[PDB]
Design a protein around this nucleic acid. Structure first.
Ligand SMILES: [Mg+2]
Ligand SMILES: [Mg+2]
Ligand SMILES: [Mg+2]
Ligand SMILES: [Mg+2]
Ligand SMILES: [Mg+2]
Ligand SMILES: [Mg+2]
Ligand SMILES: [Mg+2]
Ligand SMILES: [Mg+2]
Ligand SMILES: [Mg+2]
Ligand SMILES: [Mg+2]
Ligand SMILES: [Mg+2]
Ligand SMILES: [Mg+2]
Ligand SMILES: [Mg+2]
Ligand SMILES: [Mg+2]
Ligand SMILES: [Mg+2]
Ligand SMILES: [Mg+2]
Ligand SMILES: [Mg+2]
Ligand SMILES: [Mg+2]
Ligand SMILES: [Zn+2]
Ligand SMILES: [Zn+2]
Lengths: 97, 120, 81, 25, 206, 87, 129, 96, 217
RNA sequence: AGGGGAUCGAAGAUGAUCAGAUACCGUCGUAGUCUUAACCAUAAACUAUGCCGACUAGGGAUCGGGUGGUGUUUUUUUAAUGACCCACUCGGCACCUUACGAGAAAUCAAAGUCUUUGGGUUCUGGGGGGAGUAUGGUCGCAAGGCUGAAACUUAAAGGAAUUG
């Protein structure tokens, strides 16, 4: 039977949230279940930052990273990302890293 | 690898457990000792033993090692115990929070007063 | 816990409880006399106004209503009885 | 068979038993 | 049944306050604690160390009360206690347990850690829990040092103290030793600062 | 528990807690018995002579062992203050 | 809404005891509650209590002791026909020798044993052991 | 106090509810429905004399393998037809 | 020869305790069985039931055998002892020991009237276990024991003459039933009947009065 | 029945896949998707957990209201404000640890205060299948909703936990 008292994911006192479409497979899913990651990352990357500031005007410039919120659909979230699978107890752990 | 088995490490423990007023840091004598005090059916194994209890002996000499507690450690400790000469009578007087001193008044008696405050 | 006197409870932790959940229930609001020194006599205003109380002769103000106790308008004195 | 589809299975079957009975009215 | 000059003394009072034995735990606060004495702001509750004394006296008055002072038992896995207990244990008949415990020590004769005492004393009922638990598997009384967060299930007689380090622990243990000697014991009368340094009973260095 | 003609029949008249006066029965091995030692003039703690109590497994399970001890020994006049029947 | 005044204060007394307690605060108090709480005291099952005068229905502080196992209320106050007063005790009492069915009669509130010696019957209230 | 009305006057409610929930009882339902007399080849009776039509050979059910020898009977009192077993070795010889 | 470990295993052989009722007065935890052997030799074994149980193993199936035993006299001392072990015999070897340790006392009493020598119980007492609750209704004399074959046997050994029983659960699973029946009669020195209201002066622990006559070496 | 019809898209047609491939993937795209007027009355409409009252145990968060302060931060001239901070108090959405207690268990501050069985009240269930079927009644434009059996069959279906 049951195997989460949060149930599927986070919704106490709402009854209907409203869905979001899966970034990876367009699957609908309630935004409370959304399993979300914040893809803050550099525009450039690793080795290109030198070549950036190199063949450029301006003093080092500024460099402004590119943020977007990702929403995964479980079977997407599971198939790759933050998910693994956890022990009966490790499951309970809400802590991130 | 040369990880000694349990039968090896086991014996050596109990060996040091009761023949520290004997033995040494030397294998060769610890070796000749074993035959005298313990009975085994193997030359290979006996050395196998001695070597390690010889090693065990070598590292006790520079601080205790777990498992082996031949009580001479617990009572070398006991007399080894002491320190101090300075205590905690100097200098000034027993500094306290308001309430701590309010406490004293509201129960106790003569106390060297020295009160500061606190903040958020 | 386990043994104590419900009959003679501390005047302090008694004090901190809800106005209904005391030993004998009773209020916690008060009354006061109020002056705006242009006057000579005083009016008696309940601590929780609901109505913005108006002075005796001069239609001046006196206080304002809130979510509980009243805000006594500016230049005013008092005493509780 | 799926629970769903068996409810549609039987749903259908009624709609026709109906049809046939109406032939008799 | 009240002695006479077994009151708290100023020489004692000074002792406890340098150790900061009256600096009971923060926000944290087991309901079971009336040993408090008014809250200092900056959230540090102050301990009525007179009661702290009185309990000590009682703890003594029970430690020295068991026919064989050797099945009286010290415990502390907490490094700020190991040098304390050991020293308490030397001065009085009591057998020490400093370092890791090891479970099955009161149940299971079949072990060699095995003890079977008539009174268990402990420092910090958190870390030492094993003792406090296993002792209750087998009607053993418990004496215990306690802060304001110390869990007092299965420990009778608390000694409202300060497991926040330093000297407090070390103090108390030395005091227990003091008064179990002063109780039915080769010591002495009145004030009697006691030959032994309180700084003895301390956790070492580095 | 007596009998027709006198005769104290039925073995074992069990103990009893002191803060709860529930029976303390055989298999409760979480119960207790704390002897406080009777002292005399100048420290000396008269051995083999005690004011004693018995705390039931339940009470010290719930953690009431300490408070209840305080209250009990204080009204036995061997703790001065510490406790207050009012709260 | 609050339905049998007896029932609550009764249960509380139980849950105090059970929780190892030694006092209970009960509300709202009443003639019935007292005269019941009277009878428990009469036979040793609780100590002494006190009526406090809220200017309402009342609060009672009970001092109980530990002797008491269970104090329960019968909730449709059934009619007992003097023959049946045995049947009741039998049903719910631990032994013959002690404990009481307490009940209500035109001749007063009382324990069946007294309602035996007085030979009057009526409605049924609760019990004590 | 879950479910049922505890009132001292709730007599009717209670006795009514019982009447209803006796219907969940198969033995009861059967008895008032008169399943006895209506269906079931025997009237309401313990036995019934009929007449043989054909001798039959029923293959048993699994995991048993056999040929279970019984007779198709036309019940005299009643009309209805029944297949009935002939117990013990042989015996099916005794019919016709 | 014995050779007892445990303080209490010593005071016993040392003829310093005469009855388990001391152990019971002082709720002392028995750990060495020969304690109760000397303390109570009128005990006799009773194997109630034996059942096979099996575990699958990464290499092996393991059918060890539960055995369930009831030791006792017929004067208020009973043990329910249960152990599975890879030989039937051995399981019945160990269980009896465990059943010996387990031995508890039984408050028995009178139905109605005073008369002589308790035939029945103090009160009604319920012992629940898993899904089985047993009830013990005190019966009048000559009622005998109203209980299933097993539970009847557990009570005779307990030395109980007149008592009714109701039961309630999956009784067919014996292990859970006796374990309840046991509790039900281990529940009779729990009941604070009024006769027991008196204050007995609160006895002193054998471990202290014969502390010297105890202790290790 | 009008309107609207971007998007996405039951049906249909396609391109590939497949042994097959009425699908999964891609394309095209009807109805639908939105709105007005009237219908339908169903969802795992879920917390798979009735409502009112009472009692039983610890902890930090938090949402709204209130109360308390020679609290911070806002400077002007101190306030007044507002936003913070600490304590306490109602009533909310929850989580934490405990297990006096409860359960077949998983777990439960209620699923606890139950053979020591009674605070008040509603509703449903009584082996599995036959079956939510037949029938009658009734609602609806329809699709369908509510109400709702039996003959027969059958020794198991089922729950939770353990080990493989
Ligand atoms: Mg599943
Ligand atoms: Mg929904
Ligand atoms: Mg036609
Ligand atoms: Mg039905
Ligand atoms: Mg045919
Ligand atoms: Mg005819
Ligand atoms: Mg059998
Ligand atoms: Mg469109
Ligand atoms: Mg298609
Ligand atoms: Mg194709
Ligand atoms: Mg198609
Ligand atoms: Mg529905
Ligand atoms: Mg859900
Ligand atoms: Mg809470
Ligand atoms: Mg404010
Ligand atoms: Mg099938
Ligand atoms: Mg079969
Ligand atoms: Mg399963
Ligand atoms: Zn996806
Ligand atoms: Zn004015």
């Amino acid at each position: 039977p049951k195997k989460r008292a949060s149930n599927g994911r986070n919704k106490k006192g709402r009854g209907h949230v409203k869905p979001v479409r899966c970034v990876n497979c367009s699957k609908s899913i309630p935004k409370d279940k959304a399993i979300k990651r914040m893809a803050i990352r550099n525009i450039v990357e690793a080795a290109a930052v030198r070549d950036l500031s190199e063949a450029s005007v301006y003093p080092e410039y500024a460099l402004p990273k590119t943020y977007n919120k990702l929403h995964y659909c479980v079977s997407c979230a599971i198939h790759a990302r933050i998910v693994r699978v956890r022990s009966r107890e490790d499951r309970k752990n809400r802590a991130p890293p | 690898g040369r990880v000694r088995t349990k039968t090896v490490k086991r014996a050596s423990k109990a060996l040091i457990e009761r023949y520290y007023p004997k033995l040494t840091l030397d294998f060769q004598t610890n070796k000749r000792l074993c035959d005298e005090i313990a009975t085994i059916q193997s030359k290979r194994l006996r050395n196998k033993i001695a070597g390690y209890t010889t090693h065990l002996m070598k590292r006790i000499q520079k601080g205790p090692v777990r498992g082996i507690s031949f009580k001479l450690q617990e009572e070398e400790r006991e007399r080894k115990d002491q320190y101090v000469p300075e205590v905690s009578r100097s200098n000034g007087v027993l500094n306290v929070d308001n309430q701590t001193s309010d406490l004293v008044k509201s129960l106790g008696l003569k106390l060297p007063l020295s009160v500061i405050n606190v903040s958020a | 816990v386990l043994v104590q006197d419900l009959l003679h409870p501390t005047a302090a932790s008694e004090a901190r409880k809800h106005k209904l959940k005391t030993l004998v229930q009773g209020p916690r609001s008060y009354f006061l006399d109020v002056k705006c020194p242009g006057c000579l006599n005083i009016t008696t205003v309940f601590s929780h106004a609901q109505t913005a109380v108006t002075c005796e002769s001069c239609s001046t103000i006196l206080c304002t209503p809130t979510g509980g106790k009243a805000k006594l308008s500016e230049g005013t004195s008092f005493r509780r009885k | 068979m799926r629970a769903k589809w068996r409810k549609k299975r039987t749903r259908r079957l009624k709609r026709k038993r109906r049809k046939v009975r109406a032939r008799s009215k | 049944s009240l002695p006479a000059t077994f009151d708290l003394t100023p020489e004692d009072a000074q002792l406890l306050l340098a150790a900061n034995t009256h600096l009971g735990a923060r926000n944290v606060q087991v309901h079971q604690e009336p040993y408090v004495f008014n809250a200092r702001p900056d959230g540090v509750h102050v301990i009525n160390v007179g009661k702290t004394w009185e309990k000590l006296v009682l703890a003594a008055r029970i430690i020295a009360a068991i026919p064989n002072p050797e099945d009286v038992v010290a415990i502390s896995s907490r490094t700020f206690g190991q040098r304390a207990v050991l020293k308490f244990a030397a001065h009085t008949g009591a057998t020490p347990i400093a370092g890791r415990f090891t479970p099955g020590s009161f149940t299971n004769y079949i072990t060699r850690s095995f003890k079977e005492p008539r009174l268990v004393i402990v420092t910090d009922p958190r870390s030492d829990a094993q003792a406090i638990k296993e002792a209750s598997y087998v009607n053993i009384p418990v004496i215990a040092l306690t802060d304001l967060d110390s869990p007092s299930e299965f420990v009778d007689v608390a000694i409202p103290c300060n497991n926040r380090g330093k000297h407090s622990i070390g103090l108390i243990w030395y005091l227990l030793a003091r008064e179990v000697l002063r109780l039915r014991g080769a010591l002495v009368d009145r004030t009697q600062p006691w030959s032994i340094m309180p700084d003895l009973y301390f956790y070492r260095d580095p | 528990m007596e009998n027709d003609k006198g005769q104290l029949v039925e073995l074992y008249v069990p103990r009893k807690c002191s803060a709860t006066n529930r029976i303390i029965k055989a298999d409760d091995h979480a119960s207790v018995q704390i002897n406080v030692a009777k002292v005399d003039e100048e420290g000396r703690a008269i051995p083999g002579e005690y004011v004693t109590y018995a705390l039931s497994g339940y009470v010290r399970s719930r953690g009431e062992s300490d408070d209840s001890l305080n209250r009990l020994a204080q009204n036995d006049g061997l703790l001065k203050n510490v406790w207050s029947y009012s709260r | 809404t609050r339905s049998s005044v007896l029932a609550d204060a009764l249960n509380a007394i139980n849950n105090a005891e059970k929780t190892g307690k030694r006092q209970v605060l009960i509300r709202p108090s009443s003639k019935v509650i007292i005269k019941f709480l009277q009878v428990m005291q009469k036979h040793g099952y609780i100590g002494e209590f006190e009526y406090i005068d809220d200017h309402r229905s009342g609060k009672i502080v009970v001092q109980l002791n530990g002797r008491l196992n269970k104090c329960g209320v019968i909730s449709p106050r059934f009619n007992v026909k003097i023959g049946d007063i045995e049947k009741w005790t039998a049903n719910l009492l631990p032994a013959r020798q002690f404990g009481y069915v307490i009940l209500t009669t035109s001749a007063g509130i009382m324990d069946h044993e007294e309602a035996r010696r007085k030979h009057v019957s009526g409605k049924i209230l609760g019990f004590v052991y | 106090g879950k479910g049922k009305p505890r009132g001292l006057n709730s007599a009717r409610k209670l006795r009514v509810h019982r009447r209803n929930n006796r219907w969940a009882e198969n033995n009861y339902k059967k008895r008032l429905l008169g399943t006895a007399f209506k269906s079931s080849p025997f009237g309401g009776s313990s036995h019934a004399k009929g007449i043989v039509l054909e001798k039959l050979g029923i293959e048993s059910k699994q995991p048993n393998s056999a040929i279970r020898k019984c007779v198709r009977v036309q019940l005299i009192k009643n009309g209805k037809k029944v297949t009935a077993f002939v117990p013990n070795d042989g015996c099916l010889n005794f019919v016709d | 020869g014995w050779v007892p470990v445990t303080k209490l295993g010593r005071l016993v052989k040392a003829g310093k305790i005469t009855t388990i009722e001391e152990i019971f007065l002082h709720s002392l935890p028995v750990k060495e069985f020969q304690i109760i052997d000397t303390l109570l030799p009128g005990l006799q074994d009773e194997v109630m039931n034996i059942k096979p149980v099996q575990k699958q193993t990464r290499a092996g199936q393991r059918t060890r055998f539960k055995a369930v035993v009831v030791v006792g006299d017929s004067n208020g001392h009973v043990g329910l002892g249960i152990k599975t072990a890879k030989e039937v015999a051995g399981a019945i070897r160990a269980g009896i020991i465990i059943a010996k340790l387990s031995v508890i006392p039984i408050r028995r009493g009178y139905w109605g009237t005073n008369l002589g020598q308790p035939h029945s119980l103090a009160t009604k007492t319920t012992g629940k276990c898993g899904s089985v609750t047993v009830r013990l209704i005190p019966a009048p004399r000559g009622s005998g024991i109203v209980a299933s074959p097993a539970v009847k046997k557990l009570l005779q050994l307990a030395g109980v003459e007149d008592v009714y029983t109701q039961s309630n659960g999956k009784t067919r699973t014996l292990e859970n039933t006796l374990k309840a029946a046991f509790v039900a009669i281990g529940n009779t020195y729990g009941f604070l009947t009024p006769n027991l209201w008196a204050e007995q002066p609160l006895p002193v622990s054998p471990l202290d009065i014969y502390s010297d006559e105890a202790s290790a070496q």
